[PDB]
Amino acid sequence: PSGVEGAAFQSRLPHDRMTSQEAACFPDIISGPQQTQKVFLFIRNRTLQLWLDNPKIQLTFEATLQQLEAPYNSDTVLVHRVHSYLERHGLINFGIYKRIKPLPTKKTGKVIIIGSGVSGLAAARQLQSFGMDVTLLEARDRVGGRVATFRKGNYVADLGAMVVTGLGGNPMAVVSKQVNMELAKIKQKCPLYEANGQAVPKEKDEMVEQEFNRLLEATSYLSHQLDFNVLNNKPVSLGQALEVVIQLQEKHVKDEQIEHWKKIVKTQEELKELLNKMVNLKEKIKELHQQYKEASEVKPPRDITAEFLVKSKHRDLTALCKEYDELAETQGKLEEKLQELEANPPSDVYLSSRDRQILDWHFANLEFANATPLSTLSLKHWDQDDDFEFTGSHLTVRNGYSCVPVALAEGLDIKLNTAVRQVRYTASGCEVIAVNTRSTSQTFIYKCDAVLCTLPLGVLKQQPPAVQFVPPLPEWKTSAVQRMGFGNLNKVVLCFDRVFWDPSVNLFGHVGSTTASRGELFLFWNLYKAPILLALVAGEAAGIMENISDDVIVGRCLAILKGIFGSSAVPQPKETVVSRWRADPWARGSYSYVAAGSSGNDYDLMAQPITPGPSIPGAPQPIPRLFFAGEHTIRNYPATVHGALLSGLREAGRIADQFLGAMYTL
């Protein structure tokens, strides 16, 4: 889409309709005349288009009105109400951008942000953008959180997220214009190579993918059309629904074969019964013909009974002879209906070992996409957010996805090597106790009005607790925390010094010996200018390969590589880096998923902020003091970098509304 309707779409917003969250800020317009609404939508929409057209500089109210046209630029209070609404919820003036109206001399309010992960920096810049006092506490010695880029010499490779899942409606699209980062399109063609070292033929390769895609749809049928979502009081996982689908089809192969072979025995019994009638016809013919020859011996002139018995036997024998030919002609038809059936038997097996070994690889990829074994994804919900997909090609960063978080950190107050370890939120404010990672003796106390918590769900999940909440989080929260899934996925970075792969191929897969290792080093990427190959460990392989030394993982990687490229063409790598996100204390995992028994409505529970109890009994219910952002708090966009950033934007909006007041809801 283009025009002002494109600005709405590029902002994840219906152009022709007013959102739940615009209704709450503009209830007068929602219940008003359908014409004022349309006014509003165009009054809105337009504004986003100006922001998008030049996102490197602040979009001030004055400029917006100046470029709005009659009759829209009349009700200035509406344009004020709109431009304030957007700026506040970070649909405009978010990211880098030169500031037309430099920041206020005196700040109001004090928020501590836990973690300078991408969500963290997003809120921070926004809150600071809003005249607030922001301080970010990072346990690491670098920013970016799960956005981690490895740079040595000219080698560059992300250990963290490395793809921009399409610019259609992507806020990263705005950031790209702002922070120049080299985005490279990813050629989707991917050829698989079995363990033997030989490429799978296209006919099998196309044949297998379609079955996998068909199989997925099948599960959806089970879920939505047959209410297959509980089983012995437990919730059905996608993995369970895949086996039961494959099983039902295997069964159906056997069902077809039994029908085909039963058709055979039906004919053979007819044929065998038909033969019996032909023997017992022939022997009747044998016997008569004797009688005829015997009766014929009486020589003429014979009296007429003897003459009858000659002619009489002749009719009988011929009569039985025309029978036996009809029978040997029904024979003829059934003896070919039997080579027809042998000529057209059904399929031997639904799937052979080679097939299931390639179909493993397609499941490995699905486990990579969800960072978890398919036996954990909820059947009903694992793809709840599979509707807000961005459009366009997926892309990589050629210069390290680490540049984005580093760009965001510019001019913010970040305490590095600062491990928050206890959060105390009270009616009158909060204090955060953090220690020093380098030296754990050194203790720090941080007092503030609100605390924004971008702690990964893995860190949030840990027993015993990496971080103490006093008072404890309420059960409605903690139980949402156990229900959700935090998955794992790891990468191996192979740093060579010759280029020996098909350079025109970004990605190519390795097929596993077994279902159990379907994720083990199953896929490689040539994304980087330098000679760098990068290899994935997903599914059940993921958590296991963390118990194995680099040199073993690297050795296995080279072996798969040698078998596919020739044992001579594969040098030793000059640098090697293996990731351990599950092991990592500041992540305890990779990103999240919708575990069996969860739903996208846990992701909403995660975002609801906590309002603490009254200090003195009978005191009025206070302000909410603790809030939550990061990848696991945004329902329509979990487990991405853009999703985490949007949650940051979200809370900065929510924070500011609570402590700076909303002056746009009149």
Partner: peptide, 8 residues
């Protein structure tokens, strides 16, 4: 979650 490296 859902499925990556594709434009659907």
């Amino acid at each position: 979650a859902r499925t990556k490296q594709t434009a659907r």
